[PDB]
XYZ file of C-alpha atoms in Angstrom:
689
model
C 12.679 68.516 -18.113
C 10.035 68.233 -20.888
C 8.337 64.863 -20.624
C 5.809 63.038 -22.705
C 5.341 64.852 -26.075
C 3.291 68.034 -25.627
C 6.116 70.059 -24.125
C 8.848 69.664 -26.836
C 11.649 72.264 -26.754
C 11.180 72.737 -30.627
C 7.653 72.169 -31.706
C 8.273 71.078 -35.251
C 7.727 67.906 -37.546
C 11.352 66.735 -37.293
C 11.389 66.986 -33.544
C 8.142 65.068 -33.493
C 9.640 62.085 -35.094
C 12.972 62.225 -33.232
C 10.885 62.375 -29.910
C 8.443 59.511 -31.005
C 11.453 57.431 -31.743
C 13.095 58.165 -28.333
C 9.708 57.385 -26.893
C 9.315 53.913 -28.287
C 13.040 53.399 -27.793
C 12.460 53.852 -24.147
C 9.568 51.489 -23.505
C 7.061 54.346 -24.108
C 4.612 52.668 -26.404
C 1.214 54.304 -26.073
C 1.024 57.963 -27.473
C -1.859 60.439 -27.655
C -2.879 62.731 -30.452
C -5.523 65.220 -29.051
C -7.552 62.263 -27.750
C -6.665 59.216 -29.886
C -4.737 56.138 -29.025
C -1.522 55.141 -30.798
C 0.093 51.818 -29.747
C 2.312 49.193 -31.170
C 2.649 45.310 -30.839
C 6.030 43.922 -29.510
C 4.652 40.407 -30.186
C 6.369 39.276 -27.032
C 6.286 39.676 -23.125
C 6.955 43.115 -21.602
C 6.995 43.792 -17.933
C 3.905 46.074 -18.004
C 1.135 43.679 -18.160
C -0.135 42.694 -14.607
C -3.063 43.031 -12.350
C -1.498 46.147 -10.814
C -1.439 48.119 -13.952
C -4.807 47.175 -15.069
C -6.318 48.107 -11.671
C -4.424 51.523 -12.045
C -6.342 52.720 -15.039
C -9.733 52.919 -13.437
C -11.153 55.919 -11.407
C -8.724 58.386 -12.769
C -8.114 60.848 -15.562
C -5.684 61.048 -18.592
C -3.751 63.907 -17.133
C -2.931 61.951 -14.070
C -1.336 58.792 -15.482
C 0.706 57.691 -18.421
C -0.953 56.987 -21.823
C -3.071 53.950 -21.857
C -6.714 54.721 -20.898
C -7.172 57.880 -22.876
C -9.955 59.995 -21.244
C -11.977 60.145 -24.425
C -13.117 56.782 -23.295
C -13.328 57.849 -19.560
C -15.647 60.686 -20.993
C -17.479 58.870 -23.892
C -17.617 55.466 -22.365
C -18.993 57.308 -19.335
C -21.126 59.750 -21.519
C -23.327 56.656 -22.342
C -23.354 55.572 -18.746
C -25.571 58.554 -17.630
C -27.705 56.289 -20.837
C -26.593 52.736 -19.803
C -25.921 52.119 -23.541
C -23.345 50.044 -25.512
C -20.267 51.031 -27.421
C -17.986 49.830 -30.148
C -14.322 50.005 -30.982
C -12.439 50.194 -34.323
C -8.914 49.044 -35.025
C -6.876 49.754 -38.140
C -3.179 49.118 -39.219
C -1.042 46.539 -41.140
C -2.437 43.070 -41.657
C -1.841 40.634 -38.735
C 0.112 43.319 -36.896
C -1.871 43.029 -33.687
C -5.386 44.363 -34.395
C -4.687 40.073 -31.873
C -2.753 42.075 -29.252
C -4.548 45.412 -29.730
C -7.832 43.710 -28.765
C -5.981 42.299 -25.826
C -5.636 45.662 -24.448
C -9.360 46.318 -24.754
C -10.222 43.035 -23.113
C -7.537 43.431 -20.346
C -9.144 46.838 -19.702
C -12.662 45.437 -20.041
C -12.187 42.889 -17.358
C -11.548 43.982 -13.687
C -13.463 47.188 -14.732
C -16.419 44.864 -15.660
C -15.559 42.505 -12.777
C -12.924 39.355 -9.714
C -14.457 35.155 -6.946
C -15.929 32.834 -9.578
C -13.361 30.030 -10.089
C -15.152 29.364 -13.475
C -14.234 32.912 -14.661
C -10.575 33.524 -14.601
C -9.948 29.857 -15.567
C -12.203 29.980 -18.732
C -10.694 33.326 -19.489
C -7.434 31.533 -20.293
C -8.964 29.442 -23.003
C -10.675 32.528 -24.379
C -7.309 34.513 -24.393
C -5.910 31.457 -26.214
C -8.687 31.596 -28.779
C -6.773 34.314 -30.719
C -3.737 32.363 -31.655
C -6.121 29.388 -32.068
C -7.862 30.975 -35.088
C -4.629 32.400 -36.279
C -3.513 28.892 -37.422
C -6.461 27.788 -39.540
C -7.876 30.664 -41.344
C -4.698 32.765 -41.687
C -2.205 32.764 -44.442
C 1.064 34.391 -45.422
C 1.598 37.829 -47.096
C 4.822 39.682 -48.139
C 3.869 42.411 -45.738
C 2.851 40.057 -42.828
C 3.142 36.419 -41.878
C 0.084 36.148 -39.642
C -2.339 37.498 -42.129
C -5.968 36.857 -41.218
C -8.098 35.838 -44.098
C -11.608 36.467 -42.795
C -13.493 39.606 -41.843
C -14.302 39.773 -38.115
C -16.544 42.225 -36.179
C -16.464 40.803 -32.643
C -19.016 41.670 -30.061
C -18.686 41.691 -26.237
C -21.513 40.788 -23.901
C -21.541 40.756 -20.106
C -22.642 38.493 -17.207
C -24.650 39.184 -13.989
C -21.368 38.809 -11.999
C -19.405 41.160 -14.183
C -17.386 38.780 -16.413
C -18.408 38.418 -20.182
C -20.809 35.775 -21.439
C -19.949 35.505 -25.079
C -20.046 37.113 -28.501
C -20.858 36.552 -32.156
C -18.684 36.899 -35.244
C -19.441 38.252 -38.643
C -17.355 38.254 -41.922
C -17.733 39.587 -45.481
C -16.499 38.799 -49.055
C -13.537 36.554 -47.990
C -10.558 36.657 -50.371
C -11.148 33.843 -52.816
C -8.877 34.483 -55.707
C -5.618 33.224 -54.106
C -6.569 29.616 -54.489
C -6.181 29.930 -58.298
C -3.913 32.863 -58.826
C -1.119 34.644 -57.065
C 2.438 36.240 -57.337
C 5.579 34.081 -57.509
C 7.144 33.455 -54.099
C 3.798 33.885 -52.198
C 1.781 31.021 -50.947
C -1.858 29.911 -50.845
C -3.858 29.170 -47.707
C -2.108 27.405 -44.852
C -4.433 24.504 -44.367
C -3.471 23.021 -47.701
C 0.231 22.853 -47.002
C 0.384 22.438 -43.143
C -1.974 19.492 -43.454
C 0.311 17.588 -45.752
C 3.659 17.875 -43.903
C 2.057 16.490 -40.731
C -0.621 13.896 -41.106
C 0.693 10.292 -41.146
C 1.043 8.840 -44.689
C -1.719 6.370 -43.700
C -4.096 9.243 -43.091
C -3.191 10.737 -46.615
C -3.924 7.620 -48.516
C -7.351 7.265 -47.025
C -8.134 10.725 -48.501
C -6.896 9.506 -51.899
C -3.661 11.692 -51.595
C -0.135 11.215 -52.714
C 2.921 13.076 -51.341
C 3.284 15.374 -54.398
C 1.649 18.635 -54.891
C 2.229 18.935 -58.654
C 0.008 15.976 -59.182
C -3.038 17.887 -58.162
C -4.636 21.004 -59.614
C -5.484 22.952 -56.482
C -1.643 23.206 -55.955
C -0.586 23.325 -59.593
C -2.449 26.529 -60.528
C 0.324 28.412 -58.879
C 3.569 26.620 -59.783
C 5.291 26.915 -56.395
C 5.213 24.215 -53.694
C 8.181 24.398 -51.299
C 8.819 27.639 -49.255
C 12.342 28.442 -48.066
C 11.327 30.207 -44.860
C 8.548 27.808 -43.586
C 9.052 24.263 -42.199
C 5.479 22.973 -41.917
C 6.881 19.612 -40.894
C 7.810 21.113 -37.475
C 5.049 23.906 -37.336
C 2.442 21.164 -37.715
C 2.842 20.112 -34.077
C 1.928 23.704 -32.987
C -1.405 23.478 -34.840
C -2.280 19.937 -33.521
C -1.585 21.213 -29.976
C -4.251 23.760 -30.702
C -6.656 21.185 -32.177
C -7.123 18.914 -29.220
C -6.363 21.493 -26.422
C -9.558 23.624 -27.134
C -12.143 20.889 -28.012
C -11.805 19.747 -31.654
C -11.404 15.987 -31.390
C -10.144 13.861 -34.356
C -13.791 12.986 -34.895
C -14.631 16.664 -35.554
C -11.349 16.956 -37.502
C -12.106 14.143 -39.817
C -15.650 15.519 -40.308
C -14.092 18.823 -41.497
C -11.579 16.975 -43.636
C -14.375 15.061 -45.377
C -15.227 18.460 -47.022
C -11.689 19.092 -48.216
C -11.320 15.293 -49.042
C -14.157 15.943 -51.530
C -12.866 19.177 -52.747
C -9.448 17.515 -53.334
C -11.434 14.862 -55.316
C -13.198 17.518 -57.195
C -10.152 19.670 -57.717
C -8.511 17.088 -59.889
C -11.128 17.789 -62.453
C -9.128 19.493 -65.108
C -9.961 19.876 -68.860
C -8.320 19.330 -72.277
C -9.841 22.129 -74.351
C -12.560 20.149 -76.058
C -13.263 21.537 -79.553
C -16.146 18.959 -79.896
C -18.777 21.399 -81.418
C -18.148 21.381 -85.180
C -18.590 25.141 -85.029
C -20.548 26.763 -82.315
C -18.595 26.979 -78.957
C -15.769 24.707 -77.663
C -17.328 22.529 -74.962
C -15.691 20.973 -71.848
C -14.876 17.294 -72.021
C -13.744 15.108 -69.124
C -12.015 11.890 -70.253
C -10.464 11.143 -66.928
C -13.935 10.626 -65.356
C -12.639 8.927 -62.193
C -11.822 12.570 -60.958
C -15.342 13.662 -61.779
C -16.649 10.437 -60.444
C -14.810 10.623 -57.164
C -16.151 14.140 -57.037
C -19.725 12.793 -56.798
C -18.768 9.747 -54.776
C -18.299 11.915 -51.644
C -21.458 13.723 -52.415
C -23.020 10.351 -53.326
C -24.977 11.870 -56.255
C -25.469 10.687 -59.670
C -22.140 11.274 -61.415
C -23.865 11.818 -64.732
C -26.774 13.909 -63.795
C -24.463 16.113 -61.768
C -22.338 16.992 -64.742
C -25.494 17.379 -66.739
C -27.164 19.676 -64.190
C -24.281 21.972 -63.287
C -21.877 22.494 -66.335
C -25.076 22.650 -68.274
C -27.932 25.217 -67.228
C -31.542 24.391 -67.438
C -34.967 25.850 -66.931
C -38.635 25.229 -68.092
C -41.152 26.737 -65.564
C -44.870 26.885 -65.209
C -46.276 27.573 -61.735
C -44.667 24.313 -60.551
C -40.872 24.525 -60.540
C -39.426 23.292 -63.851
C -37.815 20.108 -65.002
C -34.151 20.440 -65.056
C -32.243 18.616 -67.880
C -31.634 20.917 -71.050
C -27.958 21.585 -71.791
C -25.772 24.563 -72.096
C -22.092 23.719 -72.504
C -19.891 26.869 -72.187
C -16.385 28.000 -72.575
C -13.467 26.908 -70.303
C -13.413 30.364 -68.635
C -17.019 30.176 -67.558
C -16.602 26.537 -66.721
C -13.667 27.299 -64.526
C -15.553 30.307 -63.170
C -18.443 28.059 -62.035
C -16.065 25.497 -60.794
C -14.325 27.846 -58.284
C -17.353 30.040 -57.522
C -18.710 27.043 -55.631
C -15.372 25.936 -54.193
C -15.037 29.136 -52.363
C -18.469 29.857 -50.940
C -18.707 26.348 -49.772
C -15.770 26.962 -47.453
C -16.692 30.362 -46.561
C -20.053 29.586 -44.839
C -18.470 26.653 -43.097
C -15.666 28.644 -41.414
C -18.159 31.222 -40.129
C -20.408 28.417 -38.988
C -17.399 26.546 -37.557
C -16.241 29.503 -35.253
C -19.893 29.657 -34.127
C -19.580 26.068 -33.048
C -16.226 26.668 -31.490
C -18.262 28.901 -29.147
C -20.650 26.011 -28.379
C -18.227 25.078 -25.583
C -17.513 28.691 -24.706
C -20.545 31.052 -25.327
C -23.146 31.495 -22.693
C -26.931 31.815 -23.094
C -28.064 33.049 -19.608
C -28.208 36.796 -20.018
C -28.942 39.239 -22.906
C -27.548 42.701 -22.715
C -25.450 45.539 -24.139
C -22.827 44.771 -26.748
C -19.452 46.219 -27.103
C -18.169 45.636 -30.614
C -14.485 45.286 -31.885
C -13.582 45.781 -35.645
C -10.964 43.883 -37.407
C -10.532 43.659 -41.111
C -7.842 42.998 -43.707
C -5.042 45.695 -43.686
C -3.858 48.138 -46.435
C -1.238 46.024 -48.165
C 1.194 47.753 -50.472
C 3.229 46.118 -53.320
C 5.295 47.626 -56.102
C 2.694 46.166 -58.471
C -1.095 46.075 -57.800
C -4.087 44.411 -59.473
C -7.823 43.883 -58.788
C -7.636 41.972 -55.548
C -5.877 45.067 -54.185
C -8.690 47.420 -55.061
C -11.214 45.623 -52.818
C -8.758 45.943 -49.956
C -7.770 49.438 -50.776
C -11.389 50.397 -51.223
C -12.040 49.597 -47.674
C -9.518 52.196 -46.644
C -11.445 54.725 -48.698
C -14.360 53.885 -46.591
C -12.296 53.859 -43.466
C -11.089 57.360 -44.009
C -14.610 58.443 -44.683
C -15.531 56.863 -41.351
C -13.182 59.085 -39.359
C -14.160 62.305 -41.252
C -17.697 61.264 -40.481
C -16.861 60.864 -36.860
C -13.870 63.002 -35.736
C -14.854 65.863 -38.139
C -18.628 65.797 -38.513
C -20.531 63.900 -35.807
C -18.153 65.286 -33.246
C -18.167 68.895 -34.455
C -22.057 68.846 -34.299
C -21.701 67.601 -30.676
C -19.571 70.670 -29.899
C -22.285 73.146 -30.943
C -24.997 70.959 -29.250
C -23.232 71.725 -26.042
C -23.075 75.398 -26.924
C -19.254 75.672 -26.530
C -17.012 77.966 -28.422
C -16.321 76.530 -31.883
C -15.736 77.740 -35.363
C -15.202 75.839 -38.636
C -11.391 75.818 -39.103
C -9.941 75.024 -42.553
C -12.056 71.872 -43.433
C -10.270 69.946 -46.137
C -12.554 68.172 -48.676
C -15.033 65.867 -46.892
C -14.332 63.559 -49.970
C -17.865 62.387 -50.413
C -16.840 62.372 -54.136
C -14.769 59.338 -53.494
C -17.998 57.782 -52.313
C -20.275 59.016 -54.957
C -17.607 57.929 -57.483
C -18.599 54.320 -56.636
C -22.052 53.899 -55.437
C -24.919 55.829 -56.966
C -25.488 55.785 -60.704
C -22.549 57.032 -62.867
C -19.931 55.534 -60.553
C -16.835 53.211 -60.686
C -18.332 50.073 -59.241
C -21.641 51.214 -60.783
C -19.790 51.322 -64.090
C -17.542 48.298 -63.174
C -20.175 45.772 -61.961
C -22.229 46.728 -64.907
C -19.374 45.700 -67.229
C -18.882 42.455 -65.215
C -22.234 41.353 -66.684
C -21.543 42.581 -70.223
C -19.248 39.684 -70.957
C -18.556 40.970 -74.410
C -16.849 43.939 -72.796
C -13.527 42.193 -71.743
C -10.806 44.250 -70.216
C -9.622 46.716 -72.996
C -13.229 47.897 -73.745
C -13.969 48.058 -69.971
C -10.892 50.369 -69.538
C -12.359 52.787 -72.038
C -15.517 52.945 -69.924
C -13.552 54.389 -67.089
C -11.165 56.893 -68.763
C -14.064 58.555 -70.477
C -16.468 58.374 -67.488
C -13.838 59.916 -65.288
C -10.438 61.646 -65.819
C -12.404 64.802 -65.580
C -14.154 64.312 -62.381
C -11.699 65.565 -59.667
C -9.150 63.192 -57.929
C -8.409 60.630 -60.597
C -5.556 60.536 -63.212
C -3.917 58.364 -65.828
C -1.465 58.519 -68.753
C -3.556 60.351 -71.127
C -4.402 63.381 -69.010
C -1.363 63.300 -66.760
C 1.457 62.756 -69.285
C 3.391 60.326 -67.117
C 5.240 57.320 -68.720
C 5.046 55.398 -65.518
C 1.459 54.654 -66.388
C 0.832 52.154 -69.097
C -1.717 52.708 -71.897
C -3.814 49.915 -70.503
C -3.296 51.071 -66.776
C -4.406 54.148 -64.832
C -3.577 56.318 -61.895
C -5.844 56.164 -58.943
C -5.170 58.799 -56.268
C -6.172 57.685 -52.806
C -6.146 59.805 -49.572
C -2.385 58.866 -49.367
C -0.226 58.334 -52.354
C -0.355 56.849 -55.861
C -1.093 53.319 -57.115
C -1.337 51.674 -60.588
C -3.234 48.527 -61.437
C -3.023 45.888 -64.047
C -5.944 44.034 -65.769
C -5.172 40.336 -65.707
C -8.215 38.473 -64.997
C -10.381 41.408 -63.855
C -13.685 40.133 -65.018
C -13.868 36.463 -63.920
C -12.248 37.563 -60.543
C -14.613 40.469 -60.049
C -17.980 39.218 -61.499
C -18.576 37.157 -58.436
C -22.001 36.402 -59.955
C -23.209 33.229 -58.245
C -26.546 32.043 -59.618
C -28.697 29.342 -57.991
C -27.431 26.432 -60.005
C -24.140 25.707 -58.335
C -25.672 26.376 -54.895
C -28.825 24.272 -55.109
C -26.948 21.086 -56.053
C -25.264 20.560 -52.676
C -28.500 21.452 -50.809
C -30.336 18.510 -52.439
C -27.510 16.136 -51.541
C -27.542 13.418 -48.874
C -24.933 14.004 -46.253
C -25.041 15.356 -42.730
C -22.393 17.977 -43.617
C -22.908 18.801 -47.356
C -26.235 20.299 -46.423
C -24.899 21.315 -43.009
C -22.415 23.659 -44.617
C -25.488 25.550 -45.733
C -26.837 26.144 -42.333
C -30.516 27.031 -41.203
C -31.620 29.102 -44.113
C -31.475 32.862 -43.753
C -28.864 33.905 -41.148
C -29.046 37.594 -40.741
C -29.441 37.826 -44.472
C -32.720 36.921 -46.160
C -34.834 39.333 -48.144
C -34.946 37.395 -51.444
C -32.296 34.740 -52.461
C -32.175 34.487 -56.348
C -29.938 37.358 -57.582
C -26.360 37.910 -58.799
C -23.765 38.175 -56.094
C -22.470 41.381 -57.586
C -25.281 42.983 -55.562
C -24.926 40.650 -52.680
C -21.325 41.866 -52.020
C -22.571 45.389 -52.463
C -24.989 44.802 -49.506
C -22.076 43.387 -47.405
C -20.231 46.516 -47.454
C -23.423 48.677 -46.947
C -24.105 46.522 -43.907
C -20.763 47.638 -42.572
C -21.143 51.458 -43.068
C -24.791 51.945 -41.976
C -24.219 50.278 -38.714
C -21.176 52.452 -37.877
C -22.853 55.741 -38.521
C -25.429 55.897 -35.875
C -23.319 54.973 -32.845
C -20.438 56.061 -30.599
C -17.263 54.402 -31.939
C -13.796 54.430 -30.332
C -10.554 54.890 -32.249
C -7.402 52.724 -32.060
C -4.571 52.931 -34.556
C -1.245 51.032 -34.349
C 2.097 51.289 -36.073
C 4.641 48.559 -36.706
C 8.160 48.906 -35.304
C 10.083 46.954 -37.931
C 9.784 44.120 -40.382
C 12.385 42.100 -38.620
C 10.408 41.781 -35.391
C 13.386 43.470 -33.586
C 12.924 44.980 -30.147
C 15.048 48.137 -30.581
C 15.492 48.722 -34.180
C 13.579 51.488 -35.862
C 13.143 51.725 -39.625
C 12.996 55.556 -40.296
C 11.656 55.316 -43.901
C 9.015 52.655 -43.129
C 7.769 54.339 -39.908
C 7.762 57.851 -41.342
C 5.842 56.444 -44.295
C 3.090 55.004 -41.990
C 2.626 58.228 -40.186
C 2.528 59.817 -43.642
C 0.078 57.850 -45.728
C -2.331 57.714 -42.680
C -2.434 61.466 -42.430
C -2.046 61.648 -38.679
C 0.250 64.733 -38.458
C -2.286 66.543 -40.581
C -4.917 65.851 -37.958
C -2.337 67.294 -35.427
C -2.813 70.520 -37.433
C -6.489 70.061 -38.109
C -8.094 68.069 -35.260
C -6.179 70.614 -33.255
C -6.230 73.645 -35.521
C -2.706 74.210 -36.829
C 0.244 76.502 -35.714
C 3.433 76.511 -33.574
C 3.442 75.942 -29.894
C 0.514 73.809 -28.689
C -1.068 73.097 -25.281
C -4.268 71.486 -24.122
C -7.066 72.714 -21.843
C -7.343 69.719 -19.515
C -3.623 69.372 -19.065
C -3.132 73.129 -19.176
C -5.605 73.382 -16.342
C -3.821 71.351 -13.761
C -0.775 73.512 -14.243
C -1.867 77.225 -14.208
C -4.664 76.867 -11.550
C -3.166 79.362 -9.130
C -2.568 81.987 -11.796
C -6.129 82.711 -12.750
C -9.280 83.938 -11.121
C -12.714 82.204 -10.816
C -11.065 79.108 -12.247
C -11.429 77.084 -9.101
C -13.539 73.919 -8.290
C -16.404 76.535 -7.915
C -16.387 76.660 -11.695
C -19.770 76.726 -13.388
C -19.011 73.747 -15.573
C -19.379 75.513 -18.920
C -16.064 75.643 -20.716
C -16.977 78.345 -23.172
C -17.861 80.632 -20.296
C -14.889 79.506 -18.142
C -12.224 80.325 -20.808
C -13.902 83.763 -21.314
C -13.728 84.380 -17.548
C -10.036 83.510 -17.717
C -9.207 86.222 -20.202
C -11.870 88.919 -19.873
C -10.729 89.762 -16.312
C -7.228 90.504 -17.577
C -8.428 92.721 -20.463
C -7.544 90.912 -23.785
C -9.254 91.414 -27.201
C -11.416 88.672 -28.486
C -9.695 87.920 -31.820
C -6.285 87.954 -30.292
C -6.927 84.379 -29.190
C -8.599 81.408 -30.834
C -10.665 78.818 -28.697
C -12.056 75.552 -30.067
C -13.084 72.582 -27.840
C -9.723 71.292 -26.679
C -6.152 72.586 -27.039
C -5.507 76.286 -26.636
C -4.148 78.321 -29.509
C -1.828 81.239 -29.180
C 0.020 82.176 -32.305
C 3.857 82.859 -32.042
C 5.995 82.552 -28.969
C 6.359 86.264 -28.200
C 2.673 86.422 -27.256
C 3.493 84.166 -24.340
C 5.634 86.910 -22.975
C 2.741 89.238 -23.578
C 0.574 87.095 -21.368
C 3.266 86.871 -18.595
C 3.766 90.702 -18.679
C -0.066 91.500 -18.874
C -0.400 89.689 -15.563
C 2.588 91.748 -14.074
C 1.281 95.177 -14.794
C -2.231 94.626 -13.483
C -1.341 93.561 -9.922
C 1.991 93.846 -8.111
């Protein structure tokens, strides 16, 4: 027979893939690895999602029913039930590849288990389940790796009601990709809202916003050079977004309100410059002859057109116990001018979206009870191109922290729990804990510590900055380039950064202005002092979960954002969920060998199969091995003491077997070579006829 996976006729790497393929090819999605979930997203309806199935995975164990509930939860999720404490789940995988449908499993599992009666429960649950595709039409954009690419960090939180159902949850994001608005690769496309909005709204609505049916005319859409996409037809897709607008609770009144922000931005975006070499010598200034663009920019803000340009493009400070008189002038280069221009254009919309989703919950979130919180992680995925750059580093950097997370959990915090119980365990080949990859970019003498430092040294452009890396490193382990590693594939200006997976080379175009992020309190304060129910509203009640002190470069602000992600994950009891994509054609039956094999490769899962386990040939569990050879051993009956370490010893000591002949960890039994299985079968034969 040999069902499932842990009974393969030939326990090898090749057979593992062939089986896993046959599994997914036969509607067997969920798969286990020691005690970790591995699922996929069909992106459509399969006949395995009903009340019967959900009710089935509750009050049982893993070795009783097919893969879905993974006992690790039933144990851990119950381990804290002794302490009535809260949990948190983390999900990783390709961008927009159901991290939307992976959470669905958690929710569908959460309900019923948490619950029922209340007519105002299952009904409002519908609008909540439709909240996923809701937010995937506004903030999401397109990527060459995925179409439904979410463009905002999200750490959801699940609370509960007195009846059982949930009450609500909060949302938190970080950084937000904000270099796509001005720069991107050919073929790709910027945010959806800018294009889907055009091919839809009545021409009458466009003219009111001072718009013309022609992207090239603007700047926001000209910085790229592309306008029409071959695959997308926003003219028809627009009706799908509008159906989501009114259905939830975003009336045209609220819509126009939101558009008044973009209406301004589109009036501010037109502000382009014709390299003004005004200064006889000093530094080329920035002149705006076509003032109606800069005028319309302030018309929406209803601020002094003149003073605005004199108080932003020009920096000013005096000081003396009071708070200065702003007027003195500092015209600067185009790059810094464009930098300041964008710097505001991004953060202005970032705060809004995060405050918008909170107001979306105004007609959803409850405020009756306060209790435990089950968190769900969801962040941008590890994207892969045949040509990387800076914007990739930030995304790839998260994975370096994500791998550190697991090693901190499935290799450190968990191993310490083994010995805390006092059960047989010995440190089996522990591959580098890679804290070097963390120290290489945190404490003094580190990448971002050497990078962000260069971001401020404006006189250190890109070529000089490069030299501050090759010398600082290319000696420390786990980092190569052209010089040391004589490989022509690496340019003299580029370098070779080794992740925990493969190899990646980066360019340098725009590094500084894109990375600096430095946002002083000159572009921020302007809007705050404006007169509009939204302009100041986008800047919500001061200090939301982030106060301390305000005036300081954003270079450190973003550093705090990532630190707020790690510290809160260390001291807790996370849960692991990792998904794999079937194919890039959304086909139900087609398996791309190379692509799938690569995913299993660069994620280092089969290595855990040899580490998390221990590493050898034929493998079997303890839990699953138990309910199979029960009537073949002595003192291994329900009268067991409970102590595994003492139970396993009782299993072998009564049949006279040497200690070192076997190896016992926490889970999974380990007997080297097949012949030894015959040695066991025979040892039992010549002790009692």
